[PDB]
Structure formats: structure tokens, C-alpha cells
Amino acid sequence: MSHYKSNVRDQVFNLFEVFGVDKVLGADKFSDLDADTAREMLTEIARLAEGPIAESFVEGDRNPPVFDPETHTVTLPEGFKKSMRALFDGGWDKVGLAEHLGGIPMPRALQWALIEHILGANPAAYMYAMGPGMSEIFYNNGTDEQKKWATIAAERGWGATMVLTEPDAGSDVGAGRTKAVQQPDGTWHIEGVKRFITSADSDDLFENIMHLVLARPEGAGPGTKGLSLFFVPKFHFDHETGEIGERNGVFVTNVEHKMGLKVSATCELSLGQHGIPAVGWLVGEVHNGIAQMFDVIEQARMMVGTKAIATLSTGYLNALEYAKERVQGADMTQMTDKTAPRVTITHHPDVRRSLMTQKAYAEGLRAIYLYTATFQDAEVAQAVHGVDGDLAARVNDLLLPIVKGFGSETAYAKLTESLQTLGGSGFLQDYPIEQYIRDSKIDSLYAGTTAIQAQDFFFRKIIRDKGQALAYVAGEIEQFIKNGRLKTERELLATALADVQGMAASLTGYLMAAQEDAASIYKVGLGSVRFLMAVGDLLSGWLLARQAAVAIEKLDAGATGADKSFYEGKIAAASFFAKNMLPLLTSTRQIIENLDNDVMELDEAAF
Amino acid sequence: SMSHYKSNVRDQVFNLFEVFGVDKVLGADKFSDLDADTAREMLTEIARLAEGPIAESFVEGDRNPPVFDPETHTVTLPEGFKKSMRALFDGGWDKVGLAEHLGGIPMPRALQWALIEHILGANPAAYMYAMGPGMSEIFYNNGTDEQKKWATIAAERGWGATMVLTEPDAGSDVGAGRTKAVQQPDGTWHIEGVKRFITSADSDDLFENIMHLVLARPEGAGPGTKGLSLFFVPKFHFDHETGEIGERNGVFVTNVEHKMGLKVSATCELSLGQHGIPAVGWLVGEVHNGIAQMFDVIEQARMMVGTKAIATLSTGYLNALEYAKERVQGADMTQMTDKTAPRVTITHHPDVRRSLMTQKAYAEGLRAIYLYTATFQDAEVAQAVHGVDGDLAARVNDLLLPIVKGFGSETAYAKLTESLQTLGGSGFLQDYPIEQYIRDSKIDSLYAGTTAIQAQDFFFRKIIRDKGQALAYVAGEIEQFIKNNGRLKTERELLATALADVQGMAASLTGYLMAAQEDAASIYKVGLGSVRFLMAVGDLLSGWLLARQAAVAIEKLDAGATGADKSFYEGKIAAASFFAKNMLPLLTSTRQIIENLDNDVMELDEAAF
Numbered sequence A: 001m002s003h004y005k006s007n008v009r010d011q012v013f014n015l016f017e018v019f020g021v022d023k024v025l026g027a028d029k030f031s032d033l034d035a036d037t038a039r040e041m042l043t044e045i046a047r048l049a050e051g052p053i054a055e056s057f058v059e060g061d062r063n064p065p066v067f068d069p070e071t072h073t074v075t076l077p078e079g080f081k082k083s084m085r086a087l088f089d090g091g092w093d094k095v096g097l098a099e100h101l102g103g104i105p106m107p108r109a110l111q112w113a114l115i116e117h118i119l120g121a122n123p124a125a126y127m128y129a130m131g132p133g134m135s136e137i138f139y140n141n142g143t144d145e146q147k148k149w150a151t152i153a154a155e156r157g158w159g160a161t162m163v164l165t166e167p168d169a170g171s172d173v174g175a176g177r178t179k180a181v182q183q184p185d186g187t188w189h190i191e192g193v194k195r196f197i198t199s200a201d202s203d204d205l206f207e208n209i210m211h212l213v214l215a216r217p218e219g220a221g222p223g224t225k226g227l228s229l230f231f232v233p234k235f236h237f238d239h240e241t242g243e244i245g246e247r248n249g250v251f252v253t254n255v256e257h258k259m260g261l262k263v264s265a266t267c268e269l270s271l272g273q274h275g276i277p278a279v280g281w282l283v284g285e286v287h288n289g290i291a292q293m294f295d296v297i298e299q300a301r302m303m304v305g306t307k308a309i310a311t312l313s314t315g316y317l318n319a320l321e322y323a324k325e326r327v328q329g330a331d332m333t334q335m336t337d338k339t340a341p342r343v344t345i346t347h348h349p350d351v352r353r354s355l356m357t358q359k360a361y362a363e364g365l366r367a368i369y370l371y372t373a374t375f376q377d378a379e380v381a382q383a384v385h386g387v388d389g390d391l392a393a394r395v396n397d398l399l400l401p402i403v404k405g406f407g408s409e410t411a412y413a414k415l416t417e418s419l420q421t422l423g424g425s426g427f428l429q430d431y432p433i434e435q436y437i438r439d440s441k442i443d444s445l446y447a448g449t450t451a452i453q454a455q456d457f458f459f460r461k462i463i464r465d466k467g468q469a470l471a472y473v474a475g476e477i478e479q480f481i482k483n484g485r486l487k488t489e490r491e492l493l494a495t496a497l498a499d500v501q502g503m504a505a506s507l508t509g510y511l512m513a514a515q516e517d518a519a520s521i522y523k524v525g526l527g528s529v530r531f532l533m534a535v536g537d538l539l540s541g542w543l544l545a546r547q548a549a550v551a552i553e554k555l556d557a558g559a560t561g562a563d564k565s566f567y568e569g570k571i572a573a574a575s576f577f578a579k580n581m582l583p584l585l586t587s588t589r590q591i592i593e594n595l596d597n598d599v600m601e602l603d604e605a606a607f
Numbered sequence B: 001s002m003s004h005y006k007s008n009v010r011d012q013v014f015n016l017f018e019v020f021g022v023d024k025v026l027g028a029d030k031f032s033d034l035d036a037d038t039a040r041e042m043l044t045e046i047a048r049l050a051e052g053p054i055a056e057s058f059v060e061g062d063r064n065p066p067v068f069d070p071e072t073h074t075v076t077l078p079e080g081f082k083k084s085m086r087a088l089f090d091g092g093w094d095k096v097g098l099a100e101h102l103g104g105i106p107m108p109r110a111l112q113w114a115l116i117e118h119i120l121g122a123n124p125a126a127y128m129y130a131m132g133p134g135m136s137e138i139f140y141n142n143g144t145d146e147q148k149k150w151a152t153i154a155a156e157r158g159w160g161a162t163m164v165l166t167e168p169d170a171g172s173d174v175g176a177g178r179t180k181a182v183q184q185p186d187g188t189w190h191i192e193g194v195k196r197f198i199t200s201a202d203s204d205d206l207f208e209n210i211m212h213l214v215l216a217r218p219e220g221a222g223p224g225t226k227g228l229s230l231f232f233v234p235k236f237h238f239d240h241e242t243g244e245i246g247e248r249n250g251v252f253v254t255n256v257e258h259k260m261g262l263k264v265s266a267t268c269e270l271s272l273g274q275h276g277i278p279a280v281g282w283l284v285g286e287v288h289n290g291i292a293q294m295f296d297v298i299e300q301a302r303m304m305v306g307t308k309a310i311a312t313l314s315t316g317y318l319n320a321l322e323y324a325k326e327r328v329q330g331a332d333m334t335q336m337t338d339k340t341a342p343r344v345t346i347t348h349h350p351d352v353r354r355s356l357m358t359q360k361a362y363a364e365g366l367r368a369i370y371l372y373t374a375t376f377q378d379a380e381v382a383q384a385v386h387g388v389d390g391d392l393a394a395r396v397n398d399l400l401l402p403i404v405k406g407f408g409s410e411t412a413y414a415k416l417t418e419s420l421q422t423l424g425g426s427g428f429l430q431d432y433p434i435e436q437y438i439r440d441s442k443i444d445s446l447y448a449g450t451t452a453i454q455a456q457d458f459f460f461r462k463i464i465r466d467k468g469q470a471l472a473y474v475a476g477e478i479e480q481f482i483k484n485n486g487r488l489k490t491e492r493e494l495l496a497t498a499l500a501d502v503q504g505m506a507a508s509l510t511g512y513l514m515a516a517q518e519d520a521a522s523i524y525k526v527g528l529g530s531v532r533f534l535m536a537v538g539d540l541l542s543g544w545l546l547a548r549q550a551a552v553a554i555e556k557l558d559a560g561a562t563g564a565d566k567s568f569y570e571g572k573i574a575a576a577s578f579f580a581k582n583m584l585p586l587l588t589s590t591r592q593i594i595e596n597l598d599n600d601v602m603e604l605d606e607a608a609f
């Protein structure tokens, strides 16, 4: 069929058998959505993804968008716009939208499971379809008058952008210099150049685009605290009827040539530089821009991590299908007999090692983002964890940089194994793995680099949090550890939990010691990404072991056939991950415990 | 990026002269007519040519890739890339290390691969196209007297060459190939089959002829690699006396692959005797010894591929470093709470220094590894610089090749991830060369034998079949460095742990092999651990060679180095110390993992994956 190989079975196993999300289906906010309907929804969008969405995956990469300087617009390849129309015609751009904007109320964990299929099949398609979701964010932060415009924007399916980055302001958002000048009538004129804006033009997919633009009001203070957020539409419109009016002064000037994700137009965006003003409306009519924009960034970060995990999953399943059919070499137990029967390559230990590595990380990462999503609804977190609203928000905030940072880094790294499994054929564009790699490289960069994820995780999600979310998660792991067929895995998990706790203590010591010895803080920076990755590995190992515990229960109860095979794979993956990935965390702890500032004191000229 | 290529002659000369003492042999015996000054001038010259005319078409070759005409069975290469090829030819760089009697300049292999590194960093496909004369020398070495005259012609005319092994069903398992050879009464052979993934099988109008060295199975020969013979199959027939090109021979490209990277290297389906015209082949050396003869070629290809990956990581790192030096973003971490603190260049950030020193230490440790390996590729160099005789040097070179290839390919691709990350969002742009470095280097874990095949060769052939003699030699050199100022005390302690870890890995895997005498399935544990073992030995060699470099750097600083020299030597100490403290300890956990491998993953139903 298509390049995209989906895994609804594993999503349903997580949602229902592991986390118990079906417990809230049929109750309260989700009163009208039952478990059967949720499963039909996943199967339906999986088929959409495997069909018309994936159909244009190759085309978007081989025949990428073209910038037109004669009109300051972008043209998209026809096959990809056909895929977009399939997404829209099915109403999938209203996934998880609030009911009053036309959505179907559902748990976030189900919402992200639906979205995984789009991100695996053609992830730029989800990015162009995020308009109604961003209109909901504008609604939540807007005045009563602005909530009327957001409703129009959602109902009409306008596109949307998030507009922060400038040539000199990427990780350091607060350095932005785009300016906002209030006009007598209460609107603002926005002036500046922004860079790397995803979907800044989208051909004729939509009748309008809502740009949500960070800019600094004249006279405002420095840094991110001096930023405000502005609603800046591509076209002016009638605030009552929605009728599209005159062009607004916000124009793309270039489209970047990228390693991958080529069909996502990534644009320099000029505001008020082409002779008409870029009129913006202060969101909520309050000056609170970085806090408002982080509502969007949080979702972008969830999407980026889920995208990376979706891509690893279809990479693994492509590699697995290939390995099952590729005949090459003799069985290793017959390697000295040059007339021995040839075997398929799944018989080779290094290939089974590779495949189980891909499998355990893909499925561990899926469990992680679905686990994370179970904290994004108060009702779900109460129902399935017994955790109240405040703690749930802090745990979600803790896990987001794991989904994003650990997800992006891990998926790209393990796709290397997926390609390797194809041999020389993995290097061909004939197979989709090399495009998976190119498309996923950006996931460690956009929505905040890995280093920024790791700094967020430690300084904000742990230290500022006074460790409360982290202690909750460590307690659940400890509970699992304390509890026969999983005794070895629980012992390996106990070592890994202790290692992560040791890392956290060492970095906390380096931070606290910076009050008297300022350079001590550098050791936190030196260790931060490795710590983030260690926590990701610990969470993967724990959730895999929890899956294997469920699988043991189901096999004991008499699972047969394809179910039995699935459950056997969960036990194998949990055991392989505990025995081959978790122990490296001990060496990483000892490395972190011995970090020093030699590398910081070295003259720059010595590099 | 046009001038994408950033060279490092200074580090090459440091290794060649200050660390390994390869100048000990320059001006003596086989190298009597090449002195150290000349060697350094050659490195400077090809590095300048690489940074200029060769690198000039690096982007062009990827963005305007070769185009196949299926009716002429030929490829057209972009003009800018052919201009780069002519610059290489006009300088004689396709004859680096060629025997004097073939028109070469005799030189140590360590110098030859250091020269080639610059071409591989600037435009690696250019060197692949230019390997013809080196092939001709291998053909010369393996040929009859008469073939030696043809090889001499081919080298003097600069013919291109290919190595033709792979078929759709015979990649890792070379012995499965079905291409056949049909003996003719006059002693020639007619070759019949379809080969796949053949690099340079057509090369536009770069050459007047191409020598295809083709593995094929004589009718009625036995199975496996042992049944294969090697055939000289020219693209054009030619006058065996004068070299004048004659009738087109029956060997035709029928497809050119669309690849992730290395796009300018035409990778070809090659049809032999399928178009009603015989593919005439001449039996190499007029003996049936094909897989042994072809491994002369494979050995050089594996060395090249490892050197290519390392060359590419080096320029990726130097590009990231020059970017990081200029990019202002954020406040110093000591001022992160003060939102009015001065902005700093990103080399001030701990994670960026960590990233950069990771790239540096791996790029420089890998350079030391391939140059160390090359010092064993001449008996006279191995004797002068290491005091080892010809037989042990060959076994040590053989031990190290899968490390250069397997560990070099895997490591370079992985650490280029850090190089790209250093550029931030800009690293994802084609405006910078790192994303093409990544795509171009992914192939290096695959062609010339996959990493799994490298690790299996390393363990079974280069350790077990060798009775551990080469490994024991290397380990003994590491042990002596550890035993020998206490300024490298911590590094030596860390290397001692890493050496014991690698020895423990080797003992575990050897134990699994011994157990396979009793339970055949125990051998699977060797396969499960083999790649991790090969990578561990690479880390150990990197950490050791960097520490040796640190010891020389300490001597030079003590003697009073100043200026740029001083900065260079300080960076060697920092790299060796960073690598010992951040890379080597992981080998302890890897050893423990290998000590506990089991066959659960082998017994699992394939359906459960």
C-alpha cells in the first residue's frame, strides 16, 4: 500500500488496556463518546492516513513548494493539496476542538492518538491544519469581541501561524525587536521581519490566515516580559460576518530550502515593510505576550515529539516488513557450511537486535506521549491516576520536554537502525526511510532546541516546581518496582531509578553551589541534556515493564492468535530494554557526578 | 555553500610528524626521494585544491545530479563536477601512492591517506571516480605479465575502474552471486549476469575507458565465494599493445539509482552480455582465485570509506565551530536570571561547548585512528615507527580496518548530528553544508560491507582466526602507555578501566563462541554483542590515541610553545581529558550488558515483533 504503516492495535492497547482511558468515555465531558466509537475513529483516521494523506508524502518532497515573488505567495504541489482536502472534507482539522467551535469532545490522549496517524503519513498536513486549534487558543485568550472573530476563524477553517522567531532571536525569544505601535483607534501597526515561520503562506488551501505575532509595544521593557501577542490576519475581514476584505500588510518574502519536511512552507515573514501597515489586535487587550504564546508553544512541543515518535513507528514497521522477506546469508549456527540453506535476515542476531531496539523505543515512546496526554485533562487524570488538577498540570508540564526533547532525539537516532535493516536499499529514495530521517531531523530544532528542552525540564519543571511533579512520577515507578516473571526487570528499573535520582541530586548540588561559586552553574548546563535523556530512558523502561505486566495477565487469561503474539512482544521488549538500555544510565550518573569546568575554561581558540 | 570544505592540515602534520614520526622514513629506502618538507607542501597544496576547485562543485553535484540516458546506457555528469575532476587529474592526484613504475610518487600510506582525506572532505565522489589508477595497480599486482602491460596502459591513460560484486540477491552474501562466466576456446570468457549498485559503472566522458573488475562463477564451479573468479572486463575493447580504444564491449548500465545522498556518484545496474553483445572478460592472473583477489580491492574500499566518514565529520565540526564563534544568542548562564545581561556568542554556553568538544574529540580521535592504521600498511613504516616486523604489521592493519570502516562510519554520521544541532534552525537549511554531509555519509555504514559484516569480520577473522595476536599487540601498547608526570594520571586510570572493559568484552564473546561447541545457539550471543564490541574498541583506541596526543602536547607546551601552537596543544589536552571522562566510562556498562546477553530475543516468534 502506502509508505505509512500504522499501529492502531498498540494505541488501543495503551489507551484501554494500560491507562484505562475508556473509564472516562461516556461520562461528563465525554458523555457522547463511547469506547467503540473512539476505536472506530482511530481506525478511520488510520485508513485516511494510509490512503489519501500518505499518497502525497513523496510528491511533497520531490516537487516542493515554490515562492512567487510576483505575488508574495507560495504554491503547493497539487497532490498535497488533494491530501489536505481529504483531511478537511472529513472534519479532521476539528480533532479535539471545543464543542462550541464545532469539535467532538474527547480525551487529549485520544486526540493525540488520532493525530499520530497524520504525523506518520504526512506530518506537514497536520501543521497546515492547525488553524482551528490555534483559533481555539485565540478564543481562550481573547476578549468577548475577539472570541467572536475566533469563532468565525474556526468555522471557516482559516489557517494559522505562530510568529516568534527573528534572525537574531530564536532560542532567546526575548531579544525580538519587531515593534508594535498603537493607533488612535486601538489597533496596532506591527513592524518587523520574522524568520522560519511555518505555513506563513499556504497557496489557496484557505481563505485567510491568522498570524499570532509576538512584538514589543513602543516603550515596553526588555526581554520576553516586554512582549505582547497580536492577532494579525492575512486579510482584513468583517468582524461580524467574516467577509474577507482588503489585504493586510503581512507578506512572506522567501521560502527556505530545507533538508526535509519540504512541503511545509517555512517563510521569512515581513510585517509592515511593503507599503501597507500590518494591523494587529492586542490579544485579550492585555500585555501578556509570552505567557499567551506559551499556550501555543506547549501544543507545538507536544506535536513535535508525537511527530518524531509517529515517524519512528512507521520507520520500524517498514524495516520489519522488509526484513521478514529479505533472504540473505545462512543461519549463524551454520556459518562455516557454505552450502547451508539461505535464511531471511530476521534470523540474524544483529538484525533481531536492531529490530528489537527499534520496537522497544517506538513503543516506549508511544506509551510516553499517551501517558503524558493522560495528564492533559483534569477528568482523565483524576479517573485513571487519582491525581487532582494542580498536580496533573505540573506532571504534564514535567513530561512535555521529555516528549519533545527525548522523543525528537531518540526517533532520529533509532531511524538509523531502521535504514540499516534495509542494507544498501535503505539509502535509496525508493524506500521511505531516508525521507523519514530528513523529515525528522528538524524535530530537535523547531519548537525549542534539545538544549532548551533540557534547560526547561531542569530549571522550570523540576527546580521551580520544587520537585513535586518529579517526586510523583518517581513514586509511581517505585510502587511498580515494589509490586516473579518481572523480577529481573524490576531490579534493573530500581537501579535506573536510583541512577536518575543520583543525577538529579548532583545537578541540584551544582546549581545550589552557584550562589557562592557562579561558574558552578555551568556543570548543570553540561549535564542537562544527558539528564533529560536518562529520564526518558527510565520512563520508557518503566512503561514497557508496565505493558509487559499487563501482557502477562492477558496471556495467563488465555490470549491466543495475533493477540498472544502481540503480548509476547511486549514481554520481550520490556526485558530487552531493561537489560540493554537501562544499565548505561549507571555510567551516565557517574559521568555527571564527575563533571568539571575544564571545557568551560578552555580558550575558544583551542577548539 | 560553495567553500564548504574546511581542512585541517595542522592536525594531519601533528599526527604524521609529532606523534607517529612518519618523517623517520622520508628520505630513506623506498621514500629516498621524498623529504619531510615536500610531504608538508603536498598536504598544503591538495588541501588548497580541495577547498577551492574540488569543493566548488560539492553543492552542484547534489542539486543537479547525474542524468541517465537508457538508450545510450550512459550518464551525463554536471559540468561543474567534471571541471573539479579535471583539476584533480591535472594535479596528478589520482596517482597518489601509485607505484613509481605506473607513474606514481612513492610515499608512505599514512601520507597518501592524509592527502586523500582532503578530496574526501571536499567532494568524496570525486575521489571515487578517480580510483581507476589505484585499481589498475591492484590489477597489475594480480595479473599475468601480459595483463601487467594492460594495467600499465590503463594507469598511464587514467582509465576509470569499478569493483563489480553485488547482485539483487547477493550483497552481504557475495557467495550467492549467479553471474556466470563461459569459457571460450581462445581462453577469454563471456560474462553473463546483472549486477547492482555498481559505483562509477558509467562516468560520462571523464575517461576514455573503464576497467570493470567483475566477480563471476565459471560454469560448473562450486558454490559460495570459493567458486568465484575475478575478470577484467573493459567497457571498450582496446589494442593490447598501444592502448588504442576499439569496439564497445558488451557491458551496459541499465539503471542509475536515486539516492539519499552521494548523488553525483552514479550507482548503477550493470548488465553483462544481455544486449546481444558478449561481455568479454579476461581471467585475472589467469587463475581461479576470485574472492581473495577481490579482497585486495575491498580492503582499499573499506579504508577509503572509513577515511571518507572521518573527513566529513572533520569539516562538519569545523563548520559548526566557525558558526558557533559568530552566533550571538542568549545571556551567559552565570547571568541567566538577569534579563538585561549582555548577549553572548553561543560558544559561551555549556551545552554548545559540550557539543563542540564531543565533535572535536571524535573527529580528531578518528583522524588519529586512520593514520595509526596506515602506519601498519608499509613494512618499512611499521618497522621504523613501531618496531614491528612485516607479518605482525599486516595482521594489525587487518585488525584495524573494520574499526576504520565500521566505527568510523557509524561514529561520523552520529556526531554530525551535533554539528547540525550547533547551527540551530539554520542547520536544517541546505544553505549550510551539514545536512548534505549527513546524507552523503549515511551510505558509509552500508557500502563496502555493512557495520554488522565489519563487526563479524573483526571478531571471527581478525581476532579468533588471528589467535588474538594483533589484538594482544595493540592492548600491550595501551598497557605500556598506562604504566608510563602525573598530569595524565586521571586519564590513564580511565584508560585502564576502558582497556579492562574491552578485554572483558572480548573474553565474554570468546566464551560464547566456546560454548557453541556444546549448544550451537550460543553463537547467537556473539552476533548480538559484536557491533557493540567493535564500537567499544573504537572508543578505546580513540581515547588512547587522544591521550598519546595529549602527552606530546604537554611536552611541547612545557618546552615553551606560544601563540596558535599553544592553543592547538591546549586543545589536545582538553580533548583527551574530555573523552576519557565522558566517553570511556560508558564501556563499563556495555561490558556488563555483553556479559548478560541471552537468547530470549532469538527465541521470540517473528510474529511478535
Ligand SMILES: CCCCCCCCCCCCCCCCCCCCCC(=O)SCCNC(=O)CCNC(=O)[C@H](O)C(C)(C)COP(=O)(O)OP(=O)(O)OC[C@H]1O[C@@H](n2cnc3c(N)ncnc32)[C@H](O)[C@@H]1OP(=O)(O)O
Residues within 6 Å of the ligand: A094, A095, A096, A097, A098, A127, A128, A130, A132, A133, A134, A136, A137, A160, A161, A162, A164, A165, A170, A171, A172, A173, A174, A198, A199, A223, A224, A225, A290, A291, A294, A296, A297, A298, A299, A300, A303, A445, A446, A447, A448, A449, A452, A456, A460
Ligand atoms: C484541537 C485541540 C484544541 C485546540 C488548541 C491546540 C492546538 C495547538 C496549535 C499549535 C500548533 C503549533 C505549530 C503551528 C503550526 C506550524 C508548526 C510549527 C512547529 C514549531 C514552530 C516553532 O518553532 S515556534 C518558535 C518556538 N520557539 C521556542 O520554543 C522558544 C525556545 N526558547 C525558549 O523556550 C527559552 O527558554 C525562553 C524563550 C523561554 C527563554 O526566555 P526567558 O529567559 O525570558 O524565559 P523564563 O524567564 O524562563 O520565563 C519567561 C516567561 O515565559 C513563560 N514560560 C517560560 N517557559 C514556559 C513553559 N515551558 N511553559 C509555559 N510557560 C513558560 C512564563 O510565562 C515565564 O514567565 P514566569 O512564569 O516565569 O513568570
Ligand SMILES: CCCCCCCCCCCCCCCCCCCCCC(=O)SCCNC(=O)CCNC(=O)[C@H](O)C(C)(C)COP(=O)(O)OP(=O)(O)OC[C@H]1O[C@@H](n2cnc3c(N)ncnc32)[C@H](O)[C@@H]1OP(=O)(O)O
Residues within 6 Å of the ligand: A338, B097, B109, B128, B131, B132, B134, B135, B136, B138, B161, B162, B163, B165, B166, B171, B172, B173, B174, B175, B199, B200, B224, B225, B226, B291, B292, B295, B297, B298, B299, B300, B301, B377, B446, B447, B448, B449, B450, B453, B457, B461
Ligand atoms: C595501502 C593503501 C593504498 C590504497 C590505494 C587505493 C586502492 C583501491 C583502488 C580501488 C579500485 C577502483 C574501485 C572503484 C570503486 C569506488 C567506490 C567503492 C564504494 C564501496 C563499494 C562496495 O560496496 S563493493 C561490494 C562490497 N561487498 C562487501 O564488502 C561484502 C560484504 N560481505 C562480506 O564481507 C562477507 O563477510 C563475506 C562475503 C566475506 C562472507 O563470505 P564467506 O562466508 O564465504 O567469507 P569467508 O569464508 O569468511 O572468507 C572467504 C574468502 O574471502 C577472503 N576474505 C574474507 N574476509 C576477508 C578479509 N576481511 N580480508 C581479506 N580477505 C578476506 C578469504 O580469502 C576467504 O578465504 P580464506 O582465507 O578464509 O580461506
Ligand SMILES: Cc1cc2nc3c(=O)[nH]c(=O)nc-3n(C[C@H](O)[C@H](O)[C@H](O)COP(=O)(O)OP(=O)(O)OC[C@H]3O[C@@H](n4cnc5c(N)ncnc54)[C@H](O)[C@@H]3O)c2cc1C
Residues within 6 Å of the ligand: A161, A162, A163, A164, A165, A167, A169, A170, A171, A172, A195, A196, A197, A198, A199, A258, A261, A266, A442, A445, A446, A447, A448, A449, A450, A451, A452, B327, B328, B329, B330, B331, B346, B349, B350, B351, B352, B421, B422, B423, B424, B425, B426, B428
Ligand atoms: C523548519 C523550521 C520551522 C520553524 N517554524 C517556526 C514557526 O512556525 N514559528 C517560529 O516562531 N519559529 C519557527 N522556527 C524557528 C525555530 O524555533 C528556531 O530555529 C529554534 O528555536 C532555534 O533558534 P535558532 O534557529 O535561532 O538557533 P539558536 O538559538 O541560534 O541556537 C543555535 C545553537 O545554540 C544553542 N543555544 C542557544 N541558546 C542557548 C542557551 N541559552 N543555552 C544553551 N544553548 C543555547 C542551541 O541549542 C543551538 O545548538 C522554525 C525553525 C525551523 C528550522
Ligand SMILES: Cc1cc2nc3c(=O)[nH]c(=O)nc-3n(C[C@H](O)[C@H](O)[C@H](O)COP(=O)(O)OP(=O)(O)OC[C@H]3O[C@@H](n4cnc5c(N)ncnc54)[C@H](O)[C@@H]3O)c2cc1C
Residues within 6 Å of the ligand: A326, A327, A328, A329, A330, A345, A348, A349, A350, A351, A420, A421, A422, A423, A424, A425, A427, B162, B163, B164, B165, B166, B168, B170, B171, B172, B173, B196, B197, B198, B199, B200, B259, B262, B267, B443, B446, B447, B448, B449, B450, B451, B452, B453
Ligand atoms: C551507494 C552504494 C554504492 C555501492 N557500490 C557498490 C560497488 O561499487 N560495488 C559493489 O560490488 N557493491 C556496491 N554496493 C553494494 C553494497 O556493498 C551492498 O549494499 C552491501 O554489501 C549490503 O548488501 P545489501 O544491500 O544486499 O543488503 P543485505 O545484505 O540484504 O543486508 C540487509 C541487512 O541484513 C544484515 N545482514 C545481512 N547478512 C547478514 C549476516 N550474515 N549477519 C548479520 N546481518 C546480516 C545487513 O547488515 C543489513 O542490515 C553499493 C551499495 C550502495 C548503497
